[PDB]
């Protein structure tokens with residue numbers, strides 16, 4: 021009534037039929053017991069060997085088949101069968117189970133082990149007694165094909181301090197030559213089975229023979245302390261098993277010529293467990309780096325991570341994970357980096373999402389002009405990652421918990437968390453399991469965050485369910501770089517509080533150097549008196565927040581980088597901050613700025629690369645600056661971007677203050693003219709006006725310029741674009757420049773949408789440096805000038821009443837040395853190769 025039945029059916033794989041018995045070896049809750057049954061023969065098939073077993077009465081429950089033996093008429097072992105991966109069978113109360121046994125093509129033999137004292141072969145008593153070893157785990161490695169096999173929880177029968185014991189239950193190994201390469205011994209006390217030691221060894225070579233038993237295979241017991249590097253490798257296996265390791269699949273984020281490894285591997289010799297993708301080791305074999313980035317881990321970080329005390333770089337996610345997996349562009353995060361390597365890695369976020377060449381705000385004409393000019397550096401295409409509101413909150417992993425054992429990793433320099441679903445109270449606040457051998461030990465150690473005096477870099481990027489910053493940040497002694505971008509789980513009120521705490525904290529406040537907090541919800545900056553405490557700040561990213569109110573840091577805070585783009589800032593305090601002699605480009609674009617803030621100095625010996633004030637409301641209040649002309653200090657920057665604003669008056673203020681501007685981008689503004697003394701005083705020139713080589717004035721309402729644009733004021737003027745304006749008469753003043761290489765005046769219209777530009781600029785072919793001209797989409801009529809082969813890029817398309825003869829440049833057009841933009845409908849005489857409609 022408590023029992024059921026089993027029968028076995030022999031199946032073929034992918035000779036026999038002399039066998040008439042089977043001894044199936046099974047295990048049911050530590051009862052390694054075998055039973056002999058007879059074979060009944062039926063019709064053979066290409067799937068069935070045609071042999072079925074007698075009913076076997078067993079008590080209802082789950083059983084695991086270890087192996088089986090087949091026997092002929094003479095009752096000799098005709099086959100030593102392995103269980104396979106279909107090792108389990110469950111007997112049912114009053115049921116009849118039929119188990120399919122598939123005969124493996126690979127010949128197997130059987131083995132027994134003999135545990136022996138080695139190294140301390142009758143010497144100074146070891147870490148534990150040989151006697152009272154109750155269970156062992158042995159790893160055997162095939163000496164030819166190098167395949168390892170793990171034989172777990174074998175019962176050690178010790179018959180008699182003294183030291184010679186055996187594993188009486190035989191195991192099934194494929195025929196070949198082996199060596200024991202590792203073991204774990206256990207002591208049993210009641211029901212508690214405890215670890216004695218784990219060692220990497222090389223036991224004496226044994227050989228397995230087909231359908232025969234090899235007796236007493238060498239397991240060389242050391243009776244020593246488990247080495248720290250072996251403890252590390254076992255912790256890695258724990259971490260891997262706790263974070264759904266079997267289901268990891270590394271994503272490199274790029275299709276190149278490398279096919280990266282998908283996962284870690286523990287089906288190899290124990291001594292090799294430190295060789296893993298993402299794991300970095302020291303000369304003694306200890307773990308110094310661990311990166312789970314790219315694998316897609318799921319689970320809780322166990323207390324076992326506390327063992328890896330030589331860990332210097334630790335990473336669970338990255339802002340770059342979906343782009344380049346484990347890498348930051350081309351380089352990796354490694355232990356003990358130089359100041360240069362560390363800085364390159366810290367600047368990765370900036371390069372990936374914030375910086376861009378300010379000359380990408382110029383027209384295609386002006387960019388082309390610069391790119392084909394060897395006297396100027398080429399314009400770097402926008403390689404940044406565009407990030408939409410839907411892309412934010414996308415997880416790279418399902419890591420829901422971080423053990424507080426992280427407090428034991430005192431040599432830790434850099435820690436990265438990103439794209440995880442954990443809550444702020446689950447980030448290194450508690451033990452993953454208070455009853456783990458690790459937590460039971462570390463509870464008795466005085467573990468504190470105050471000991472991570474080497475941890476300078478922390479990343480908490482895009483953690484959606486994080487409602488505030490975790491407490492561990494405020495207890496870090498030497499924090500320098502912090503990234504908390506895309507934590508839209510934190511409210512505007514909560515973020516202001518968290519930043520205030522961070523600044524007010526006597527630990528971190530005066531130590532923070534880099535602060536990335538873009539794509540968040542901040543509406544107001546913390547109180548100035550608190551922001552002033554951030555004495556060592558050098559980088560600040562507040563892009564894509566909802567910032568409507570700024571507070572100053574003061575002029576004692578010297579910033580190298582400042583990115584305030586995409587917010588709702590109306591004014592920047594005159595004392596917001598100061599800047600270093602290392603500034604490349606500052607971002608203030610996409611705001612509601614009414615004025616250019618007086619926070620720069622044109623009298624500064626260091627010249628910044630650029631200031632970006634595009635997409636604001638400058639000039640909407642009547643003047644481009646809020647201070648007096650006498651108080652205005654100018655801007656020490658080569659490029660000034662003021663496109664998409666409400667500028668009605670040309671910013672003379674910049675030139676009058678001797679600003680070393682070489683490119684001025686004033687496109688998409690409301691100017692109707694640039695009268696005389698806009699770029700100069702009445703009887704002279706401003707100190708640095710001669711540096712102005714590029715001018716973008718497209719999409720304005722300009723009807724006139726002045727003699728301010730002649731070589732007497734702009735002698736090195738190279739590129740100018742006045743396309744989409746209201747010129748009815750060509751402004752020839754810029755053509756006075758001997759250095760003018762490109763000029764554009766496309767699509768001139770009046771308010772009433774008429775094509776107001778009809779006259780060709782007669783004499784333009786004499787411009788000594790002019791290469792490109794754009795006069796397309798106007799109403800150009802007759803052209804009497806003989807075109808020069810020197811001005812070899814000409815756009816005259818969309819001029820329907822044009823009458824021009826191109827005979828002079830006709831052989832150059834044919835030789836592919838002249839680019840003419842035109843319509844086959846236009847009256848263009850002199851070149852048959854053009855295909856003009858006759």
Ligand SMILES: [Cl-]
Pocket residue numbers: 638639640642643644666667668669
């Ligand atoms: Cl204005």
Ligand code: NA
Pocket residue numbers: 295296297298299300
């Ligand atoms: Na590695």
